Amino acid sequence: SDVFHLGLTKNDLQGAQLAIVPGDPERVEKIAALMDKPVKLASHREFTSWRAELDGKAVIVCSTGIGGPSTSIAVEELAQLGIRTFLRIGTTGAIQPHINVGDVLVTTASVRLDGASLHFAPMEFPAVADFACTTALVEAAKSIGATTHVGVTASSDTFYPGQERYDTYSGRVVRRFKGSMEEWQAMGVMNYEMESATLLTMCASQGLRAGMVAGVIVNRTQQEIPNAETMKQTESHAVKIVVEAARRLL
Amino acid sequence: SDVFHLGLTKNDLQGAQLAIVPGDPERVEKIAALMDKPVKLASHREFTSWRAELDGKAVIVCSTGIGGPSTSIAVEELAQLGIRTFLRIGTTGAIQPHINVGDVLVTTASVRLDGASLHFAPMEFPAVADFACTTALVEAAKSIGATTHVGVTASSDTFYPGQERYDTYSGRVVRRFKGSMEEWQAMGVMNYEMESATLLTMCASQGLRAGMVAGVIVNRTQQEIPNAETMKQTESHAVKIVVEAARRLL
Amino acid sequence: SDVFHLGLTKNDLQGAQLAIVPGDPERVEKIAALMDKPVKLASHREFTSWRAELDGKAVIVCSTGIGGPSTSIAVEELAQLGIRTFLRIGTTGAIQPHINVGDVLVTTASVRLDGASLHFAPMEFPAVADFACTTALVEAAKSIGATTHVGVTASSDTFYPGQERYDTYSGRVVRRFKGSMEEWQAMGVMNYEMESATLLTMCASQGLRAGMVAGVIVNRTQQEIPNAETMKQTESHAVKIVVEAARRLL
Amino acid sequence: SDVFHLGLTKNDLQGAQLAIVPGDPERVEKIAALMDKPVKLASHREFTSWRAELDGKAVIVCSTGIGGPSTSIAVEELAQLGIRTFLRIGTTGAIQPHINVGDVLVTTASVRLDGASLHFAPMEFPAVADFACTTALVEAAKSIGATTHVGVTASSDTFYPGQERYDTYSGRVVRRFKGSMEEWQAMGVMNYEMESATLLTMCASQGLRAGMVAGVIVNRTQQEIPNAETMKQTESHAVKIVVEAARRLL
Amino acid sequence: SDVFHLGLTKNDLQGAQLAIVPGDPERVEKIAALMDKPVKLASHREFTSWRAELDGKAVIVCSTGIGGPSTSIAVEELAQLGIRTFLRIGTTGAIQPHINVGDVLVTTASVRLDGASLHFAPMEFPAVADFACTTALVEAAKSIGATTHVGVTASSDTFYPGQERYDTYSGRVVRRFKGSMEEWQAMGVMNYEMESATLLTMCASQGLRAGMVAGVIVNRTQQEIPNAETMKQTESHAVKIVVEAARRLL
Amino acid sequence: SDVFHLGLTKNDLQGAQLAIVPGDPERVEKIAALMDKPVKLASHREFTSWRAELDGKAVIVCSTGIGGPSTSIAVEELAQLGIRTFLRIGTTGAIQPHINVGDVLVTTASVRLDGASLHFAPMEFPAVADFACTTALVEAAKSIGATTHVGVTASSDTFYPGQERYDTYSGRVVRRFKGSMEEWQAMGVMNYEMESATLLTMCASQGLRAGMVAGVIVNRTQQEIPNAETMKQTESHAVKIVVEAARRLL
């Protein structure tokens, strides 16, 4: 085609400028089952892309995969095929008690705890979402009436220490993070994830717009445990949400 | 007695929730004035606050001073008196060729090249604008008919080495601070204010709604003679946007 | 004239190279009054100059404002107007148990807790006060019989988080400044303050003779009463010492 | 399952305690095809794991993915199930002119040019490899006669954008990582990679041994388009080399 | 006569390419004492060096003194004079309970808690020992039959704070070094010393092999009462190791 | 005895509470030559300890060694034995063209370009000299009417690889030391050297009066090289200045 690790050409999109990029590519297919006339574009490494329409428009849903080292690849190669709006939808677990599993999270900006974003702009520069993609994500959630949360997200690079988890092998998080989470709550940040730091900033630093929505799948605070049975919320909600939000900014 | 700097008391606030924090008091009342029952409360160093009303509510108009260190005081002496919303109004300049003098720039967040922000949250945390205050300042520039620009702002502690200008003889500049403009320009930053850095961050890290609207009085980009008419005209419009923006946040 | 910022020119300055610069604008006149034939000069921002004369040579007390970015402008313009000597006088919080309210403090060098300092010199570079001024000032100290102390001051860009105050809105302190006071105290630092660093640095780095003197208005240790107008006899002291001191340097 | 990402249980390894962690899964399946009793255990996300035998020993050959974020999860979730030693292998290029295709680069320690590493240890701590591991690797290339080079590898978070080189689209070519590739070379570095630094640091600091043998399938400094077959060849030797390293290491 | 500090010239090493560099100049004769045709070359300051031979090969036995600024001097001087391989021997204080006195520690790459090393390579770069030199060291401590431990060593620029020692005058360590011991031990670092980082660093970044072995003199984590004469046999072990290991390379 | 490195006991100091900290052991005696009833106490590695008595008061003179690491031990161990004041006297190169070899300079504070200081106080903490100790030196030079220059100095960790000397092996530098000394001219720094940084910092932060005199035995930048005829006179200028100074601190 022209890219590399995505193997989609330049016509596979047919004037596609938006892209609902999710984490696991297991989701990319079900995300498009929500829209119309899709197509399994490609699927190379962990970059599974589809192609669906909407309101007479052409948008694609490409999976980005764990962390920005990969994330940038997708954003990189997709944004050069044409996409100028990157809508991210994934799962997560929040750090604040006031957030009930099954609440959606629209994120204005994320706490950069990664070293990849630094490859696009200084640590001074913010990993802030796009207003258009942000209002179009809080109205979307409100449209279905979901108890949405807008704030900031702590975008770490590790699933264990950057998120201060002690239920691990060593059972010890490095000094810089010994207490990070208790600091994150006091500052109001909503949860933890690992791809927004890259996306937010690499988009915000080059004529690209983007936003992030996520569904609280679990939550490392609320005592009583959920139910997997009711973990499908990502479907009728977040997934629905992103498809709807994308509708708007189409 | 009371508040060490601002010098007020809760009684003066009269249960006020909001507060328009401009720079100088020379134009602090001009905001108040546009409100109902404007009443000068206190005025000490450069901490000059009034008090009016909006839709039966009470608003405060305290000035901040120069640089984030000064503001940090108002925004803290203030918040203790009750206020939880801080809208900041002020005129500004532009780095982008496609931005004009009548335009209004709504800061989503700002690159934190300031200094007092780090007193509140590591340079990793985002200096992002609270959705409401971000959205509210858009509603206005659209209800009055003004052209608005969303985006990121540069927030340094210098009046010259940070806005592309060097003629104040000595005035050294570390290895970094040099040609920075050309950088941000490619990154999308629009203006070079100096306060929002602490405003956004300090409030963000401490659970507070806050936004910042700025009328672009001038713009270096072109070699066009900048008249004085609009340098006053667009301001009033910038005063109308916040004022029209405070009405919603009450 | 040649300055609209501070509003003056060399011609205005009477042609004198020395400016006692305080942070409070309501003290400028108050110090120039103890000088000779002082004439009100201007009042733009919190920067308010008051020309005068001492022992046969002109002097221009000019308020510098709160915070190093405030003082940057201050010192910066006064300097390209003529001044080659600066003597800061103000209110300060003492950390040490034995430093008493009313006592006078002379700053040799200070811990850098600002940002403006960096818009002038790397942090490996010292925030050191001019020996001559340190000497002139310390000398003038005993010239009245004040209980003086000499040493490192801690210059924070924030009154609360930077000087580790917890009785604020949120009540927490970024880990960076958490424990600090203990560490400063142990490290010998004798007082908190927010302007000397930008000063001593901006001057030190280039060719300028800056100096620092303050008076304990509050002691962040003892549990007694901070009196009523405990912000007067102190100014009486220091103003004298900064006037006696400068008088010598001139 | 017993983990949250790999999809394996602390029972699908049967002692294992050793694993080989490469980029893509396409390799971990053929990697295992070299040891006896291949048994594909899972494939959840970028983590595809196989079980095999070697002199009656249980061994895991799970893939890491892209970047330390992914790799961190594997090495972490593995170490939990028993793996106490992680051996890495990868294809690569070399910046050193004298280094040619088909050579093996056993790495002792890598230049922590990443942010992931930081979640496990300070920048002053070395990203160093285990002694037995670097030996079992070096010795196994000896019992193969492959031009081996032992030393330090570079590992940041990029492969085209935000790097130093010039070729993507646009103009911004980073700052901190500009014209640095030169120093990395005269620093004696060999290859450029992106997952080591984490592997070495998250193992070197958490009581877990790890090694790394890679292959030179291409050389930039060397003006010559490599060979497709040499790469099938080169790949092969690294495979035997790492499997043979894993062999003695039990 | 030549350089200054060392007190040598090229024709005093006699083609020697290896230098054994211990700290104590009182201990140079004891090491050269075990080789053929020993000869004293210079004694200026702390830089004491003897010239020897092994298997018919002239080997320089030079000192470095206390600290790395001086260590650079040494290493830097020698290399200029021919030496391309430095064998550093020392004594030390182990921080791991499992490690007792009389044992032998081989340093793979040490923590750069030093500073002079930054004058050679970015902190990112690893203070890695030369592989070869390490092997010879480890197989040397075994041939003599010595309880050995190989791994990470911590190199501090100070002997009191740097190694979190509190039995000092001030009885106070800085934040960067408070509770840093549990840190180092938990991370797995085996000991503390003061020069490794500068050697391992200026050599690895400058095409020079280098190795270090040390003799346990104290155990930071110790509880049993140290026996009778605890030193005499301690300090001589690594002497025959360093010399033996020195053979294997030559 | 009571001290580990120096090897002395409290009685050996004989109530002494002040010490002259030179660089090498040749000087420690020439200094003790002037003072009344000098006695050699010890000489372990680089620290040669001597005792004297100025005006009837026990004065200690001990060597510190090359680089900060070494200094810190002599200092601390001295302070453990009852010394509160440290007079530094040595010889140095000048970066200023209005300054010449044969001149004496006092360092009010230094440009922390070292690594050992950082283990006493953050890089924000200033390297200033105790007023009393630095005042009894600029005035103890008037007793000799010599070209006295007093400002800050630049304490490095290495000679040329820490200041940039186009002639050595490393060539330029790892992008930092590519003209700093030229920056320091602009900064106003008068001379270049090493220990002071650590010396001031560790004393300034621990409650120990500290000072520093030195003369130019070479016009460092201004192409020069010392000699016996002159070099002695200069070393006398300082040896006396530092003994005369030391007299007044008792």
Swiss-Prot record, chains A, B, C, D, E, F:
Its EC number is 2.4.2.3. GO terms for biological process: nucleoside catabolic process; nucleotide catabolic process; UMP salvage. It catalyses: uridine + phosphate = alpha-D-ribose 1-phosphate + uracil. Keywords: Cytoplasm, Glycosyltransferase, Transferase. CDD domains: UP_EcUdp-like (cd17767). GO terms for molecular function: uridine phosphorylase activity. GO terms for cellular component: cytosol. Gene3D superfamilies: Nucleoside phosphorylase domain. It is found in: Cytoplasm. InterPro entries: Nucleoside_phosphorylase_CS, Nucleoside_phosphorylase_d, Nucleoside_phosphorylase_sf, Uridine_phosphorylase. Pathway: Pyrimidine metabolism; UMP biosynthesis via salvage pathway; uracil from uridine (phosphorylase route): step 1/1. It comes from the Bacteria. Homohexamer. Belongs to the PNP/UDP phosphorylase family. Catalyzes the reversible phosphorylytic cleavage of uridine to uracil and ribose-1-phosphate. PANTHER family: FI09636P-RELATED (PTHR43691:SF11), URIDINE PHOSPHORYLASE (PTHR43691). This is Uridine phosphorylase. It comes from Salmonella typhimurium (strain LT2 / SGSC1412 / ATCC 700720).
